[PDB]
Amino acid sequence: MEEAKQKVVDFLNSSKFYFNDFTDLFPDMKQREVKKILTALVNDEVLEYWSSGSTTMYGLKGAGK
Amino acid sequence: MEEAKQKVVDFLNSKSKSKFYFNDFTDLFPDMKQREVKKILTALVNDEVLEYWSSGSTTMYGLKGA
């Protein structure tokens, strides 16, 4: 798959991570760009996300369970 | 994803251990051919939804990260 998406899968495939923890890992990306990459992974069901506090939290599919 | 692949995902995303045998899945899909079940599971592994394990004389599958 895509390189930026694989970077996200490997980081978690190893704590609690929010949307801004990901935008920190992609310095040369826009907030818009990173949200799209993470949303594409949720669509494909590699990741699963939800509303947590005043932002969003992401994890590998089944993290909640 | 397609119905056959979503079926697999719903079963593993439950409260159910980390990995199951290839035959645990063919057990769930009695209608499907063994070849077709191996096909969808290999595809799910290719898309990194599932992790693949060689176990004994057979194979094991589970949610990536499990």
The experimental resolution of this structure, in angstroms, equals 2.4
How far, in Å, CA of B40 to CA of A32, rounded?
33
Q: Which of A43, A52, A51 is nearest to A61 (CA)?
A: A43
Q: Which of B53, B30, B39 is nearest to B2 (CA)?
A: B39
Tell me the CA distances in angstroms from A40 to A25, B5, B7, B44, one per residue in order.
Answer: 17, 17, 20, 16
Q: Which of B1, B5, B7, B48 best tests the A interface by mutation, with the highest count of A CBs <10 A?
A: B48
CB distance B51 to B61 below 8 Å: yes
Domain containing A2 — which CATH number? 1.10.10.10
**Experimental technique:** neutron
Tally of structural domains, chain A: 1
How far, in Å, CA of A11 to CA of B30, rounded?
37
Closest CA–CA distance from residue B15 to any residue of chain A (Å): 6
Residues of A in contact with B43 (CB under 8 A): none
Full domain range(s) for residue A22? 1-65
Residues of B in contact with A46 (CB under 8 A): 47-49, 64
Task: Return the residues preceding each gap in chain A, C–N over 2.5 A, or none.
Answer: 14
